[PDB]
Write an enzyme that holds these catalytic residues in place. Sequence first.
Site, PDB file in Angstrom:
ATOM      1  N   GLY A 184       0.977   5.220   1.918  1.00  0.00           N
ATOM      2  CA  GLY A 184       0.629   6.156   2.981  1.00  0.00           C
ATOM      3  C   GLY A 184       0.802   7.592   2.523  1.00  0.00           C
ATOM      4  O   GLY A 184       1.172   7.829   1.365  1.00  0.00           O
ATOM      5  N   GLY A 216       0.801  -1.215   0.000  1.00  0.00           N
ATOM      6  CA  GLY A 216       0.000   0.000   0.000  1.00  0.00           C
ATOM      7  C   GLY A 216       0.832   1.263   0.000  1.00  0.00           C
ATOM      8  O   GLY A 216       2.068   1.205  -0.020  1.00  0.00           O
ATOM      9  N   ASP A 267      -1.737   8.431  17.533  1.00  0.00           N
ATOM     10  CA  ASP A 267      -2.396   8.083  16.272  1.00  0.00           C
ATOM     11  C   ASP A 267      -3.056   6.696  16.370  1.00  0.00           C
ATOM     12  O   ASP A 267      -3.017   5.905  15.422  1.00  0.00           O
ATOM     13  CB  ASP A 267      -1.478   8.253  15.050  1.00  0.00           C
TER      14      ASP A 267
END
EC number: 2.7.11.1
Length: 324
Positions: free
Chosen positions: A45, A43, A153
């Site tokens: 970010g 993926g 986070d």
Amino acid sequence: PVPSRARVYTDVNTHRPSEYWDYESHVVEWGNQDDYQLVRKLGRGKYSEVFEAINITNNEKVVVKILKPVKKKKIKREIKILENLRGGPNIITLADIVKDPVSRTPALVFEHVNNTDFKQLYQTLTDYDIRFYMYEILKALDYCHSMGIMHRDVKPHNVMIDHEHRKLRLIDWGLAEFYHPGQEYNVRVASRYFKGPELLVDYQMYDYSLDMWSLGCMLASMIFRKEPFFHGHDNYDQLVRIAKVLGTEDLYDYIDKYNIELDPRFNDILGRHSRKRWERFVHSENQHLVSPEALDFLDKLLRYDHQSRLTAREAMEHPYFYTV
Ligand SMILES: NCc1ccc(-c2ccccc2)c(Cl)c1
Ligand SMILES: NCc1ccc(-c2ccccc2)c(Cl)c1
């Protein structure tokens, strides 16, 4: 504003040499990028690209997070925190730190987790499974808070779960920070839906309790099957969404306790809201995940006043976890 301090692990960094918390002075040493063969893209970010890779020296799968070097100080912070926390319960292991010579790009090499999909999780998970994984996250938070670090986070995308092996890892320490009593922090942290009211009202003297709010948001979405639980469309609206559940009276008591100046952008959107009972979010599709213990535990996390939230250790002692 009125000052505030964490109720737990208040002085852990105060009592340690600078080397522990002074990440700006930390010396970063590179491993050998040639030891890793990139397999596939996992993926992308905000400022990173994640790959599955093989460590060719031991034939072990790893994850390589290629960072876009935007701020050096921030990369040093993440590395120092990952090194400090390495080996803690349910903390992702930083296996290596490498650089690409030609492109001049840093990369972090982590232990690989065979992550079970989020959409493939919230429908098959049982009441027990929710309690079990919530307790696993608490182990990671009580550990990092005890190590004087706020994650800042906490959210589902930052919790990797290998359901087959009942293995959980808390990842993405890029926003994490060292807790120093009295320090005023940047409020532009956490992901919108998981931001604590302290951030939304620009109260800078926050602490580990910010992570407990985020955890509460995760719990509410799981037990009620409402993802995200507080669905703000911007940072101002995010507070309104919280106020629609928690009510505006307690919002003003919070602002008054800490002498917080409420941004004028709230003037036309905040309105007036009563406090809602947690039981009103129960429906036929989620009732098998809800219990009095589940709602009592949630009520003790989702509180405006950052000081009144359970600490990770207090949360671990809640009746909701008696069965884990
Ligand atoms: N041996 C193949 C290979 C090539 C480049 C990198 C790389 C890319 C970006 C940043 C750091 C290392 C890596 Cl991790 C492996
Ligand atoms: N990586 C996505 C994801 C999905 C579900 C949960 C979860 C599971 C149990 C209890 C609370 C949250 C978590 Cl921690 C992460």
